[PDB]
Design an enzyme around this catalytic site. Sequence first.
Site, PDB file in Angstrom:
ATOM      1  N   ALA A  60     -25.605   6.141   5.613  1.00  0.00           N
ATOM      2  CA  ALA A  60     -25.584   7.326   4.771  1.00  0.00           C
ATOM      3  C   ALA A  60     -26.733   8.256   5.124  1.00  0.00           C
ATOM      4  CB  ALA A  60     -25.655   6.938   3.311  1.00  0.00           C
ATOM      5  N   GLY A 101     -23.170   2.161   6.449  1.00  0.00           N
ATOM      6  CA  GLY A 101     -21.892   2.837   6.671  1.00  0.00           C
ATOM      7  C   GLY A 101     -21.526   2.918   8.148  1.00  0.00           C
ATOM      8  N   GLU A 104     -19.977  -0.210   8.958  1.00  0.00           N
ATOM      9  CA  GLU A 104     -18.693  -0.155   8.250  1.00  0.00           C
ATOM     10  C   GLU A 104     -17.678   0.670   8.993  1.00  0.00           C
ATOM     11  OE1 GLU A 104     -20.491   0.783   4.169  1.00  0.00           O
ATOM     12  OE2 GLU A 104     -19.119  -0.857   3.457  1.00  0.00           O
ATOM     13  N   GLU A 124     -27.784  -2.295   2.326  1.00  0.00           N
ATOM     14  CA  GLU A 124     -27.520  -1.647   1.060  1.00  0.00           C
ATOM     15  C   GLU A 124     -28.154  -2.367  -0.125  1.00  0.00           C
ATOM     16  OE1 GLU A 124     -25.263  -2.103   3.550  1.00  0.00           O
ATOM     17  OE2 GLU A 124     -23.811  -0.403   3.615  1.00  0.00           O
TER      18      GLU A 124
END
Length: 692
Positions: A60, A101, A104, A124
Site C-alpha cells: 500500500a 499488497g 498479494e 500487515e
Amino acid sequence: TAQYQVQDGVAVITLDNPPVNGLGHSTRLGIVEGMTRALDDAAVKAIVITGAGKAFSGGADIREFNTPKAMQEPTLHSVIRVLEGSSKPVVAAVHSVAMGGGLELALGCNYRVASKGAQIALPEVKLGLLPGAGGTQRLPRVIGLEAAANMIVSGTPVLSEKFAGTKLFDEIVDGDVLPAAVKFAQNVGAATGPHPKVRDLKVRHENPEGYLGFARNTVAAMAKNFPAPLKCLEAVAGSLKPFEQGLKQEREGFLYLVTTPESRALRHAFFGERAASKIPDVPEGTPTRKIEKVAVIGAGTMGGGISMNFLNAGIPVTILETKQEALDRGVGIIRKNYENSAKKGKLTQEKVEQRMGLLSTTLSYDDLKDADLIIEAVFEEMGVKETVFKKLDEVAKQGAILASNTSTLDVNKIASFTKRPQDVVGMHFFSPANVMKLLEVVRGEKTGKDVLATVMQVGKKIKKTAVVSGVCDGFIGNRMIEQYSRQAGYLLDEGALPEQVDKAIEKFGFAMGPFRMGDLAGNDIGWAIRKRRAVDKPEIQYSKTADLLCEMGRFGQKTGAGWYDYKAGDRKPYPNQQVNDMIVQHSKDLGITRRKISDEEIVERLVFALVNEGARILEEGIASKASDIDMVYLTGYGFPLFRGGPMLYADQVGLYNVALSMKRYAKGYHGEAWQVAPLLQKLADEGKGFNG
Ligand SMILES: NC(=O)c1ccc[n+]([C@@H]2O[C@H](COP(=O)([O-])OP(=O)(O)OC[C@H]3O[C@@H](n4cnc5c(N)ncnc54)[C@H](O)[C@@H]3O)[C@@H](O)[C@H]2O)c1
C-alpha cells in the site's frame, strides 16, 4: 502509474511509483488499463507484471492512507479479480521487494518468476491488521499452512531463494528477472488450455488442529494485548476451507481488526514518528550543518550512553572527563555494555571493536577543537554547567553546536554563558540512553532554526525519536510525569499501597509503575527537585509520603531499598513493612479514613493527570502537536504501544467523558489538581479529539 510495453508477443506492465511502487490509485488504474490494452491486442499472447527501480512492490502507498483514493476503484481486490480472470496468462516477475499488497498481487497471477535476494513479506500485522486481499488464503496454498502462518503472524521478510521447492515461484533465477520472465511468458502463451490459479490448489496438512492448537498458545503468549496476531492465525486456518469461504472469513478478520483501538494505536505510532520531525516555523529544506565528529562531556551513565548512539551509527566521539579514572571507568562500562549485548546475539564481537575503535578520550578541552556537535552531560548544578559552557565557548570551532543533556536546568540561562546562544540547544536523552528511543530537543529562545534542523537530522541518524519541546520546568515528559506521580502519592494517602498502584497501571499496560520507576530513577532525585518548588515561587502540594521515604534513606535500587526491597540479581520488587506502616501512619496523621481504591480509579487518576497536563502543554505551545506528546510517552515512559499514548487514549475514551470524570475528582481529596485544562474542555464541548 504503470508503464506498458509490448515486446515479442509479451505485454510488460511495469509498476512505477517510487520509492517502492506503492499500489496507489494511479498505479492500480494503470495495471488495469494495461491489462485492458493487452487483452484487446491480438499480437499479445502473454503478460508480464513487474516493478521499476528498487521494487516489484512494497504494497500500500502510505501517502494514501487517510484519503478516499485509498479505497477508490479499481482497488487491489478489483485488480486481482482482473488478473485471475485474464484469458491470456499473467507472469509476475518479482525482484528486490514483494511485500503486503505487492505479494498479494503476485499471488493473483497465473505464474510467478523471481530473482534471488528479493525480500518477501506480509507485514500487515505490524499495523494491527492482516493481509486483506487474499494473502492469507493464497499463501498457505503455495507454501503450506505452517510456513504461511509464521510469515503472516510475525510479518518478517524472507529472501526469495529460500522458497525453492515450494510452489510460490515457478522458476527462481540468478540475474535479472525480466528477461527470464519474458522467455517464460513466451512458452506459456503458446500453449492453450486454461492457466493455473492459486485458488484451485489445496492446503494439504496431516494434522491441522495438532499444529493450530500449539500455534494458538505460542501466539497468544507472545501477542499480549495485540489482537491482530491471533486473527491472522485464524485467517490462515481458513485456507483449509474452499477458497471463497476462506476469503470471506479473511475479510471479516480484516474488518474486525480495522475497528480495533489497537490498530488505531499502531497507526498513530507509525505516523507520529514521522510527524515528530515537523516543527511549525522551520520548513523542510531549511539547511543543516554537517555533523561529522562529536564530543561528549562526562563519561557517566548518560555521557557513556549518549556516546554509544553515535558510535553505533559510525560517528566518532571524543569523551572528555576531569580525571583519568572517571574516563577509564566510563570506557570500561561502555565496553561491558557492548560485550554483553554481543553474548545475547545483538552484535558480533567484530562489530563491538569497530565501535570502540571510533571512541576517543581526553582530559583536555583542546582536543574538542574540531567537533561539530558537543553534548554536555555533567552534574546537575548551574555552577558546574557555567564552567563547561565557558570552557566550550572558548574552544569549540565556529559553527559547532553546543548541547546540554539537562533535564531540570534552564536551557536559556546555560545559553547566555556563551556569546553564541543561537548555537545552544537542549538534547535531553533518556536513561539508558543507548536503548531509550526518545530524544527531547529543547528549543531555547535564541536557538537558531538551522541548529534545530540539524539536531533533528542527527536524531534521525542515531535512530532516536526526536521531539521538539519549548522551555518550561520539566519540558514535555517530566512535566507530565510530575502530575502522574502526584496522583500516585495522593492515592497512598487515601488508601493505596505501592504494589497495588504499580500492578494496576502495569495491567493497563505501562512497562513499569510509578513506585518501581521512582525506585529505579533514585527517589532522592525527586526529593531534591520538590525541595526547590516550595523554595521557588510555587506552593503546589505533594503527598509527604515520598519525603518521608527519603528521610529514611530508602533511595531505591541503588541503596538496596526504596518503596520496595531489592535482593541482588533478583528481578522482583519486594513490598516492605516499614514503608507500608509509614503510609498507614501518615493517613492516620492526616485525619483520613483509608478506603478501598479500585484499579479503575488508580488508572484513571494517573492517566487523566497525564492528559490534563498534556492539554496545558498544547495550549502553551511547549509541544507543537498532540502526537508528539504521545511519541514522548511511547518512547520515554513505557506507555503501552497498544493504546497509542495518553492523548490518543483520551480520544478513544472520549473527551466529554474524560472531562466529566475530572469534575468528579475535583470534589475529592486534593480537588484543585483536577481543574479541567481549557483546551480539553473546549475540544470536549465541540466533539473533537486532540488527534482527530
Ligand atoms: N538533568 C538531570 O538530572 C540529568 C538527566 C540525564 C543526565 N544528566 C547528567 O548526566 C549524568 C550521567 O551519569 P552521572 O552524573 O551519574 O555520572 P557522570 O560521571 O556522567 O557525571 C558527570 C561526570 O562528568 C565529570 N564532570 C563533573 N563536572 C565536570 C566539569 N566541569 N568538566 C568536565 N567533567 C566534569 C565527572 O567526572 C562526572 O563523572 C547524569 O547521571 C547527570 O549528571 C542529568
